[PDB]
């Protein structure tokens, strides 16, 4: 009821600081667009330094969120995962939608722990999009060697 509204004031306030409780709080609530914003500012900058599982490290720790993915439940797994289905559609954003996916298979077993809902439409749906994004970045990579390779 009312604590949902003041809880949304907590979600508006939490974006100034850390992103973990903002991530879980906006994850269990509405709306997923601001959830896309905090994942954008978190996973947005290109960085490839020391150990993570989805790339959540900065000057302030965001690999705590790596444990918060570990603590997440199945209905939030399917609720986030259909947002990955929605975010795999358009170009130039799908990379963000890649990052959590490589996370979750590291933090749950192969069974997608025991009691599992229906997501065969999902795990069917994500394969052609990523298969399609395979070849484009392959062409940028193999054409990127050509500017070096001449001289």
């Amino acid at each position: 009821k009312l604590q949902v509204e003041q809880e949304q004031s907590l979600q508006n306030y939490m974006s100034k600081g850390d992103w973990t409780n903002a991530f879980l709080l906006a994850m269990t609530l509405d709306h997923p667009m601001r959830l896309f914003n905090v994942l954008k500012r978190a996973l947005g900058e290109s960085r490839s330094r020391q150990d993570t599982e989805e790339g959540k490290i900065e000057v302030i720790f965001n690999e705590e969120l790596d444990q918060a993915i570990s603590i997440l439940n199945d209905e939030q797994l399917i609720l986030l995962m259909k947002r990955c289905r929605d975010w795999n559609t358009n170009a130039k954003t799908h990379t963000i939608a890649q990052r959590t996916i490589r996370c979750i298979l590291m933090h749950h077993n192969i069974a997608k722990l025991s009691e599992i809902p229906g997501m065969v439409k999902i795990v069917d749906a994500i394969i052609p999009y990523t298969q399609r994004h395979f070849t484009r970045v392959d062409n940028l990579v193999e054409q990127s060697y050509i500017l070096d390779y001449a001289l």
Partner: protein, 778 residues
């Protein structure tokens, strides 16, 4: 033809009633300024007319005022009483001089009426939240660029704490929000209602809120994760507003339960006796309570169209309240309510406006004497020619006789009706009375002095006219208005069967009807040339008629709501139309044209008469007052010359001992303008640009690939551009030397192939990571 009147703001009007007080302002302390339909300066302990700021002629301007009509929302004074400031019913705030009545500035930016307007403790900031769901800060310069807080959906109520920081807000949206002053963000919103925050007051550290819930909720100032201290319940109905004591040892509360009560050990209860009172609180639910600046009394803004004086039971103050006093109004609000009917005399010096319980005497703007016998609002008024007597008709079926000398009724005209008197008028000398009566008959009345046996001062009813049983489908028998031929040949009278019937001076013969009206009529009149007659009806249609029937001259259909009164000029040249939509309409009688439209009546006009003088206009309204009248590649080259022009400036910083593109660095400019141009034919913009564009170009690439900015451009854009600029021109067709650009490109492309190979490996594990669970879900 020349009609009288002007488009100026004032024509010696008496339109300001000094009534309907909602708020009030404490100015010099001894004087208290009253928010009304003007700014009326009062004394706080006498209640007399010190000064009234209204429309007129300030020195140095024309069509300027002291205050306006269309009721003032808040009045307040400057902290050194050196500024005047009124928020009105419009979206514009006016600041007037305190001493003179000139104007300083007009503040606009509100689309609705101002519901919150006050100064600060510094005074240099003005604050005004309005009914358009935002609060706007202001400056004496006119600085709108400071703040604009909009997070609400209704009108706004509460505000400042004098720390010059850390504001709070209470609004009528069902929300009470918290804010920081520097960079506004809703850190916390408190919600302890479901309706409307009526009145707001902080005591010293306790903020209380009043609402429809009829409860007083208390609150702490230095608050976070809302602090609650308890709820006072059940005032009896919803509280309207309240006030803290200026000495801050009590707290007075007000409601629409007509009871004011103060807390005292102030405390969380009421712990002082209240049977000391002798001058009981109020007749009407009041709007705002102020402790008086003399520290003994009370000022109460009632909804009974006046504000008043009282006290609060305590030993420092008067332990009872005194009788309420009012200012010297012009005796237009000293008498009680709305005017239904006005009348003029022959000497043009008797203006009389009747009411629920009063009849007043005016010459032009000076009042002589009141006369009160009205047991109702007077539907009609009629003088005696000569100004000796006046005949009145109330909502009782009762006609009253008043003399002009004093308030004493000479004769109560004999109660001979079962329905009220709507209309009445007299002949040329004044010896025949025809009246409005739903007794299905038309009543003539005698008139003379009483020195005989037939009273003409009590109008003995000898003659009888009745033939009213004509059959229609609307209603058989009711009259609306009556009208006497000034040449005395006939009588015209209105009916409810959409007709008018004309019968001559003696008994019934049928001159003429008029019928065809979709709605019944309110006003019919005869001119002095006596060939035509006007008619006005509630179908928004005024018709002129001669003698014809079924041949419409012109259906003058020009209004939006039903009419009130349409009359000729008293010398047969002009006719005017006042209606329910508060606008006066001047119309030339010889043509169907209009000469002047008068919109200065923000109040609904009910009745209106114009004298035989031909120099003024008298109006009755709902404020009961009278208004008297008379390149793309150049964006790239300019961009690169700018960004390299700054990078070389920052390069020789101190080892060697432009405000805007836009960012903390110009290079965030440079890539984003690449995203600004469109996806098609930007290659034409690239192939324009020479080798100097290339030399100044690659440095931004190494800048953003050392800066690891993927947040404002993307590797498909960078490869999509660089792969074109390498194929146009060139590396060994612009120079041939083993230079810093040549080894610069080597680290650039290594950065790109590594950073893109990372995403390649992540996707290349992601897909086959997804397949193998579908291998098992067989």
């Amino acid at each position: 033809a020349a009609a009288f009147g002007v488009i100026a703001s004032n024509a010696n009007c008496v339109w300001i009633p000094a009534s309907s007080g909602n708020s009030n302002g404490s100015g010099p302390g001894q004087l208290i300024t009253s928010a009304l339909e003007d700014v009326n300066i009062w004394d706080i302990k006498t209640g007399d007319l010190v000064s009234k700021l209204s429309d007129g002629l300030p020195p140095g301007a024309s069509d300027a005022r002291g205050a306006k009509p269309a009721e003032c929302t808040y009045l307040e004074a400057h902290k050194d009483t050196d500024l005047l400031a009124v928020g009105y019913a419009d979206g514009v705030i006016k600041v007037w001089d305190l001493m003179s009545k000139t104007v300083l500035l007009n503040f606009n930016g509100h689309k609705a009426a101002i519901t919150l307007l006050q100064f600060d403790g510094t005074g240099t900031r003005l604050i005004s939240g309005s009914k358009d769901s935002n609060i706007i800060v202001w400056d004496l310069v006119g600085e709108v660029g400071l703040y604009k807080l909009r997070s609400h959906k209704d009108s706004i109520t509460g505000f400042w704490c004098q720390g010059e920081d850390w504001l709070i807000s209470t609004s009528k949206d069902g929300m009470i929000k918290l804010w920081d002053l520097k960079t506004h963000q809703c850190i916390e919103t408190h919600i302890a209602h479901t309706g409307e925050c009526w009145g707001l007051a902080v005591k010293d550290d306790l903020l209380i809120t009043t609402g429809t819930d009829s409860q007083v909720k208390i609150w702490k100032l230095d608050i976070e994760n809302d602090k609650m201290g308890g709820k006072l319940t059940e005032m009896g109905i919803f509280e309207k507003q309240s006030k803290q004591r200026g000495l801050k040892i009590e707290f007075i509360t007000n409601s629409s339960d007509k009871t004011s009560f103060f807390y005292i050990q102030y405390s969380s209860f009421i712990l002082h006796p209240f049977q000391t009172i002798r001058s009981l609180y109020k007749i009407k639910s009041a709007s705002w309570t102020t402790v008086s600046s003399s520290k003994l009394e009370l000022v109460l803004t009632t909804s009974s169209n006046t504000i008043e004086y009282y006290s609060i039971p305590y030993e420092k103050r008067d332990p009872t309240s005194p009788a309420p006093l009012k200012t010297h109004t012009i005796e237009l609000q000293g008498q009680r309510t709305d005017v239904r009917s006005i009348d003029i005399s022959d000497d043009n010096k008797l203006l009389a406006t009747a009411s629920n319980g009063s009849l007043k005497i005016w010459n032009i703007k000076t009042h002589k004497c009141i006369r009160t016998f009205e047991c109702g609002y007077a539907l009609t008024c009629k003088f005696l020619p000569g100004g000796l007597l006046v005949i009145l008709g109330t909502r009782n079926g009762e006609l009253q006789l008043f003399d002009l000398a004093s308030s004493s009724l000479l004769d109560t005209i004999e109660d001979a009706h079962d329905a009220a008197i709507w209309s009445l008028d007299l002949t040329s000398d004044g010896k025949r009375l025809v009246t409005g009566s739903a007794d299905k008959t038309v009543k003539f009345w005698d008139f003379k002095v009483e020195n005989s046996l037939v009273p003409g001062t009590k109008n003995k009813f000898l003659p009888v006219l009745k033939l009213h049983h004509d059959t229609t489908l609307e209603l058989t028998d009711d009259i609306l208005c009556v009208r006497v031929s000034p040449d005395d040949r006939y009588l015209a009278i209105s009916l409810l069967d959409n007709t008018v019937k004309v019968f001559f001076l003696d008994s019934m013969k049928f001159y003429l009807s008029l019928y065809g009206h979709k709605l019944p009529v309110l006003s019919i009149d005869i001119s002095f040339d006596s060939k035509m007659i006007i008619t006005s009806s509630a179908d928004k249609n005024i018709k002129i008629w001669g003698l014809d029937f079924g041949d419409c001259h012109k259906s003058l259909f020009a209004h939006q709501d039903s009419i009130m009164n349409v009359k000729f000029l008293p010398q047969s040249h002009n006719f005017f139309s006042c209606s329910k939509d508060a606008v006066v309409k001047y119309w030339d009688g010889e043509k169907f044209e209009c000469i002047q439209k008068l919109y200065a009546h923000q109040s609904e006009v009910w009745a209106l008469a114009v004298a035989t003088d031909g120099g003024f206009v008298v109006s009755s309204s709902h404020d009961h007052s009278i208004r008297i009248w008379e390149k793309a590649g150049e964006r790239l080259m300019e961009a690169l010359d700018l960004g390299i022009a700054e990078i070389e400036g920052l390069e020789a910083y101190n080892r060697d001992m432009v405000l805007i593109a836009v960012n903390k660095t110009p290079e965030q400019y440079i890539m984003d303008t690449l995203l600004r141009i469109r996806m098609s034919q930007l290659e034409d913009a690239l192939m324009v640009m020479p080798f100097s564009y290339v030399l100044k170009f690659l440095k931004f690439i190494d800048t953003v690939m050392q800066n690891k900015t993927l947040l404002h451009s993307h590797l498909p854009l960078i490869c999509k551009n660089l792969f074109f600029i390498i194929k146009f021109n060139h590396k060994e067709l612009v120079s041939q030397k083993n230079e810093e650009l040549k080894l610069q490109i080597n680290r650039v492309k290594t950065e790109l192939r590594s950073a893109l190979k990372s995403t390649e490996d992540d996707l290349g594990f992601n897909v086959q990571g997804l397949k193998f669970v579908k291998q098992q879900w067989n």
